[PDB]
Design a binder for these strands. Sequence first.
RNA 1: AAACUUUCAACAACGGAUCUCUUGGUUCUCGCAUCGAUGAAGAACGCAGCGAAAUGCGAUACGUAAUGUGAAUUGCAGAAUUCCGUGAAUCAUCGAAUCUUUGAACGCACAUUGCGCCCCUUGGUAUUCCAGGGGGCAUGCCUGUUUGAGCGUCAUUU
RNA 2: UUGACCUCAAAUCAGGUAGGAGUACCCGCUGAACUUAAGCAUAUCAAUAAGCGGAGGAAAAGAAACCAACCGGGAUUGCCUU
RNA 3: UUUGGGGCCGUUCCUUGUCUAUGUUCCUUGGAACAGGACGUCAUAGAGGGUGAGAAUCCCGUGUGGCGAGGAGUGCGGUUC
RNA 4: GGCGAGAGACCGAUAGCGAACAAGUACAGUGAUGGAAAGAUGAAAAGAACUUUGAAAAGAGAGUGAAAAAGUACGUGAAAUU
RNA 5: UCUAGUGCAGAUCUUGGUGGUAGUAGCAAAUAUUCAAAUGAGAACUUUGAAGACUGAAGUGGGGAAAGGUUCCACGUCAACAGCAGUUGGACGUGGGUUAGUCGAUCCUAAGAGAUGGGGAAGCUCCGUUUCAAAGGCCUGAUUUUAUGCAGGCCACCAUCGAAAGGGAAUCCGGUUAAGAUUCCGGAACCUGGAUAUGGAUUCUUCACGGUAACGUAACUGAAUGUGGAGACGUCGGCGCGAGC
RNA 6: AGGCCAGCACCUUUGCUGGCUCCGGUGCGCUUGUGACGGCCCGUGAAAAUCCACAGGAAGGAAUAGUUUUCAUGCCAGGUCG
Lengths: 50, 101, 119, 85, 60
Amino acid sequence: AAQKSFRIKQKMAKAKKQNRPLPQWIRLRTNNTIRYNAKRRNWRRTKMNI
Amino acid sequence: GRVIRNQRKGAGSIFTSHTRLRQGAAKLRTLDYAERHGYIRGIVKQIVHDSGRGAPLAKVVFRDPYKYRLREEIFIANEGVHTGQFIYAGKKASLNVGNVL
Amino acid sequence: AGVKAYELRTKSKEQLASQLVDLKKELAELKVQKLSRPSLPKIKTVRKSIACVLTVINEQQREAVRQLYKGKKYQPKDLRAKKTRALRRALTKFEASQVTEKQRKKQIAFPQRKYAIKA
Amino acid sequence: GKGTPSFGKRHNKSHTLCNRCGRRSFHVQKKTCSSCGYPAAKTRSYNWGAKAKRRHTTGTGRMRYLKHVSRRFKNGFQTGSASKA
Amino acid sequence: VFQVSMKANKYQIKKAVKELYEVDVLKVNTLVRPNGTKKAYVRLTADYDALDIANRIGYI
RNA sequence: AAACUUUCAACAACGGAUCUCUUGGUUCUCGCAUCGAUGAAGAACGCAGCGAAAUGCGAUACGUAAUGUGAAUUGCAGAAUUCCGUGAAUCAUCGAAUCUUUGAACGCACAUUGCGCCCCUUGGUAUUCCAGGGGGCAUGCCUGUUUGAGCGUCAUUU
RNA sequence: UUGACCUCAAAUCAGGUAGGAGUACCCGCUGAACUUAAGCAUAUCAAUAAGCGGAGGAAAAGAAACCAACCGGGAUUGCCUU
RNA sequence: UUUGGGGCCGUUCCUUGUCUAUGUUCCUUGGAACAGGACGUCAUAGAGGGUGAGAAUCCCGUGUGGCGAGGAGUGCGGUUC
RNA sequence: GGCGAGAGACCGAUAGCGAACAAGUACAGUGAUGGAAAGAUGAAAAGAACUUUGAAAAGAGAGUGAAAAAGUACGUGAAAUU
RNA sequence: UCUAGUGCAGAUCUUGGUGGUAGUAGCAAAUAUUCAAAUGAGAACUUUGAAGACUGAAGUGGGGAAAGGUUCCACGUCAACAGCAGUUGGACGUGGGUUAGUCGAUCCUAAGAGAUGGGGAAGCUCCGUUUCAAAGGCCUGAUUUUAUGCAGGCCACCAUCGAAAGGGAAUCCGGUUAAGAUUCCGGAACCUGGAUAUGGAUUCUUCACGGUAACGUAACUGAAUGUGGAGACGUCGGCGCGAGC
RNA sequence: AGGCCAGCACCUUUGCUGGCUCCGGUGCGCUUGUGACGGCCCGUGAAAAUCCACAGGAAGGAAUAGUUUUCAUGCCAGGUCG
Ligand SMILES: [Mg+2]
Ligand SMILES: [Mg+2]
Ligand SMILES: [Mg+2]
Ligand SMILES: [Mg+2]
Ligand SMILES: [Mg+2]
Ligand SMILES: [Mg+2]
Ligand SMILES: [Mg+2]
Ligand SMILES: [Mg+2]
Ligand SMILES: [Mg+2]
Ligand SMILES: [Mg+2]
Ligand SMILES: [Mg+2]
Ligand SMILES: [Mg+2]
Ligand SMILES: [Mg+2]
Ligand SMILES: [Mg+2]
Ligand SMILES: [Mg+2]
Ligand SMILES: [Mg+2]
Ligand SMILES: [Mg+2]
Ligand SMILES: [Mg+2]
Ligand SMILES: [Mg+2]
Ligand SMILES: [Mg+2]
Ligand SMILES: [Mg+2]
Ligand SMILES: [Mg+2]
Ligand SMILES: [Mg+2]
Ligand SMILES: [Mg+2]
Ligand SMILES: [Mg+2]
Ligand SMILES: [Mg+2]
Ligand SMILES: [Mg+2]
Ligand SMILES: [Mg+2]
Ligand SMILES: [Mg+2]
Ligand SMILES: [Mg+2]
Ligand SMILES: [Mg+2]
Ligand SMILES: [Mg+2]
Ligand SMILES: [Mg+2]
Ligand SMILES: [Zn+2]
C-alpha cells in the first residue's frame, strides 16, 4: 500500500538490499563452496509475507 | 447434542440490546430530601421518541438544591403531558397528571 | 597506522576532544572522496582512531568517578562488579561465617582433633 | 463458489508482525501473538511443541551476553587488568 | 543534497549545516529513501552559493 | 532386398548406483556448575575499500582497549612504518569499555519509528513558547525517613 | 493548647528486592484417553502423557511421636536382596 | 584439666605458558617416495595427525621430566606478631 | 539440558540428529505449525595462452597436466532408457 | 573363530531416475490485420510511418482504497522465463528515483477492546471499567535569604486503545523531471502557537456609539460558576436556484 | 500567466519580435451541489474531541495622563512517518 508504516518500509528496504546476485570475487576465495545466491527472491515468484 | 438457541442467548454476543439511539434510562428523580418533605418543581422541555420503545420520553429539568446547576431527568411521558408543563415531585405535591407523588 | 593509546593516555581531556573533532573532520573529508575514487581504505584507520580516542576518554572519566566514590559504600551500578546476579545476592563470607556464641564455645572446646592409630 | 472465486476476496490481513518475535503471527483484533504470546510476560511454549521449542530456544540467536559467561567463570569472574609480565 | 541519519530531524540538519559549513539555511526537506537512508534537500539563502560551497566541500 | 522391430557387443549418451573417501552424526564414560532489573534468552534494523548469506559486531558497529605470541592478511586492491620492535595478524587470550531499536521491558502507548511530565544547560530580545543536548519519571513487597489522617485513643492545658 | 501512642496512608523519599529465559535431572499441584481385559462399566494403561507453579548444581529426605518383638537394632539417601 | 586471632614462605586445588630424542644416507619404480630393497639411529617417545601414494627416525606432536606465570584457599607444613 | 574432555566390534551422504554444505535454511500455510534437497576436478588451477570456422554459444586444432577415458554439466561412472 | 542394522521381484512398498504412449492430445473464447522502411547475424510478433479496425465515457480511458513491494525510469542486454518467436519485456545485469506547517496518519470518540482498585481462581489467568478506593491538577500571585514552598480560592471527569471511507485548524494557479509533486521553482494566500511595537479605537459621564425596531459598525474590559449553540446526521418524491458539461 | 497565430532568425545553448485572447443566447437537457416543501415509519434515522456565544460581575483600572491587543499592520517557528 502507498500509505504504509515505517516498519513495512524498513523491511522492504532490507529486501531491496538483499535482492542481489553474488559478488564474483567470493567465488575465487580459498576453500569456497558458494556458487550462487540461494536466498534470491523475486516479487513474481515468492511473496515476503511481512 | 448441540446447544440450542434459547441456551445460546445468555452469553449475550449477538443477542444483546441495541442501545445506540436510546436517549438514556427512563428513571425517576432520586429521592433526596425535597421529595420526602415537600415538593420540587421541574419543567418539561421536550417529549422525544425513544428507539426500542413505544412510549415517549419527557426530558424534565429540575434545579439542584445544593449546587448552582440544572440537572436534567428522563421521565416516561404520561398521556396529557406537554412542553412547558410544570412537573411537581414530592410528598406535598398536588394530585395532577405528571406529578410524582 | 592510526593513533596509539599509550601516547593518548598522557594527554588531557581537552587535547583529546580536539583530536577527536579533527579526526571526525578527516573522516568526513574521506567520505566525500570515497564516492569519487573506486576504493579508499584509509577510512578504516580514521574510524579505529576515533574509537581509540573515545575509549581513552571513557577510561579517564570512569577512573575519576571511581576516585570520587573511593572508600565509601553505595557506588554506581556501572562501577560495581558484574559477577552474576546470584553471586551478587549470595551471602558474604562474613555473613556466612557468622555463628552463635553457643557454637563458637563448642568449636573452641571440642574441635576436630588430629589423631593417628599406631600406638 | 467456495474455491477459486472465494480466494479472490482475500485482501485483509489477520496477522501482522510481532514486535517481540518479528514473525507475522500477531493477531490484529485479539492483540496477541500466535507464536510467542506477546503481550503476555511469559513466552509461549509447550512440551508438545518440541520442534517449536528447538526453533526459538537458547542458542538459535546471538547469545549476546551469555556466550562470555563460561569464559568469565573459567577465569573466576576476575576484576582488573593484566600487568605486563 | 545530503545523506542524513535516520534519527535526525530538520532542526538538527539545519543546525549542523550552519555549524559545519558556516551557511545560513532557508528550508530543509526530508525523505526516507527505499534503501532505508534519509535524504535531505537543504535550500540555502540567496547570499550563499551551493555551487561555490560544494567544490569547497570537495565534490562537484 | 531395404526401411522398421527385436537381441548382443564396441563407442558415445541419459542418469547418478557401486567402490573408496569423511572438519558430520549417534551412544558410553569422565569432570564442572556459570543466565537475568548491574537489563537475560529471543527479535528487528544496521555495520566491511570491494558481501548477498553464514559468522562476528552495535553509530567506538566483521570491531576499540588490555595482555600474550612475534611478522603477517590474502580473492583483488591498498597500506607500509608495522619489522634487532610498546609491534603485523579474519591470530590467541581477555580482567577495561562501547553495546542502535527492542524484549521480563520499567513515563503513557505501539497495526503509530505516536503523546507526554520533571531537573540542569545552550540558543532563539523568554519562569510560561519553540528547538537542541544531557539526566530522570513502572508495578508489588521489605527496612527505615519525612509529611500527614482518624472523638481509635492517653495525658496535659485554662 | 501542646506533645505522645495505636492503626492506616502518601511520596520520582534513602537503600534494596521479585518477575523472564532454561527446564535433562529435582520439589509439588493438576490430570486423561488410546490400550489390556480377546466384548465392557470397576480395574488396567497411570497415581503416566499433556497443562500449571517452584529450585539447585544436585534437589529432596534426614537425626525417630522409626523398625521391632530379637541376646534387640538405631538419622537420611542409594545398590544387592527381601 | 584445656583455650584466640592475624601476617610471611611453602604445600593442596584451578587455569595457563614454555623447554625437553633419533636419516630425510644410497639404488629401482613413479608426476610426486611416505612404496620396494640396502645400511643405520632413537625408543619411559612404534598414540594420532600432516606433508604431491602405507613415514617412529621430514613437521606438529607423543613419552619422560624440568622451568615459570596468574588466581582461589583456610585444607595443613613450618616461621613471626 | 549447558560448558569442557576422552572413547566405540555404532552409521557412513536414500545411512547417521531433520540438518557432514550460507539447516531449523530455502519453501508452504491466515496461523498454530510443517519442513527439504544439496558432500568428492586435480598434488598443484597449472581452470586451456594462441590460430581458424562461426553473429554468438560453441567447435576443430594447439597447449596444461601423470591422466582432459579428470574441462568448474568436473573421482569412479552401473542399470533402466537412448 | 566372533558378531549382526546380513541376501529382494512383488508389499495400490519408500526415494530417486527413465520409458512406451508421442513429435501424439493439443497450443481454436474475447470481430483483424496488412504494406514499406530502419535496426539487427537473424524479424508474422521490436521501433517508426502509412492504412484498416476495436473498446465506445455503467470504456480496452483517466485516478484511487486494499493487496503487492520497486514491478516506476534509464542504460546495457538475451543463457533461462514470456506453453510459437523475440533484436522486445512486469525477464536478466547495473544504477537512478518517492522533497508537505495547509494532503493523510498523528487527535476524537463509535460498536467494542482493555489496565488500575478490589474480588475469584491450585494456577496459566478470569471478572469488571466507575466500580464497596484516602484514586487529582487549574488559575492568580506572595516573597523578594530565593527559589518556589507557604498565603489563599477553584474544581471533581476518574486509565488507555479503537476509523488513512465517520468527526477534524489551515493552499491555490502556472511551470518543471527519464522517472517526484496540492510536497520542487515562481507568484499569490491561509491557520495554529508564541512574542511583541506602532497606528487606530476608548476614558475627566471611566470600560463606544447609531437605529422606534429587526439590527448595524474596524475596535469598543469581563475571572469562578452556569446555560445554550455549532460539531451533529434518515430515506424517497417532485419544484426552484447555482456550477461544470 | 496559459491558449491560438503571424513574421525574422540558426552546425548551435537556439530563440527573438509582434498580434488576438471579444460579445452573447437557449433548456421538463446531463451530472452534481444546495434551498424551501411534501410523504413514510409500533423504523423518527451516532457519539466525542473541538470552537463560539450568552448569563453573572470577581478583579483590575484615567487626566498632564492612562487603559485596551476578538480592529489594522508588523516579527519568529511550524516537528515525526507516508
Ligand atoms: Mg472480505
Ligand atoms: Mg478478523
Ligand atoms: Mg515528508
Ligand atoms: Mg478391550
Ligand atoms: Mg481386542
Ligand atoms: Mg471397544
Ligand atoms: Mg509433564
Ligand atoms: Mg537441600
Ligand atoms: Mg529439610
Ligand atoms: Mg586416470
Ligand atoms: Mg578421472
Ligand atoms: Mg566423471
Ligand atoms: Mg544400458
Ligand atoms: Mg534389514
Ligand atoms: Mg527392487
Ligand atoms: Mg516373493
Ligand atoms: Mg510401484
Ligand atoms: Mg497435432
Ligand atoms: Mg481446445
Ligand atoms: Mg518498465
Ligand atoms: Mg516461448
Ligand atoms: Mg527463444
Ligand atoms: Mg480483563
Ligand atoms: Mg486514539
Ligand atoms: Mg479518520
Ligand atoms: Mg455521522
Ligand atoms: Mg476522514
Ligand atoms: Mg506521476
Ligand atoms: Mg512553493
Ligand atoms: Mg466606534
Ligand atoms: Mg448540537
Ligand atoms: Mg423528510
Ligand atoms: Mg450519484
Ligand atoms: Zn511474537
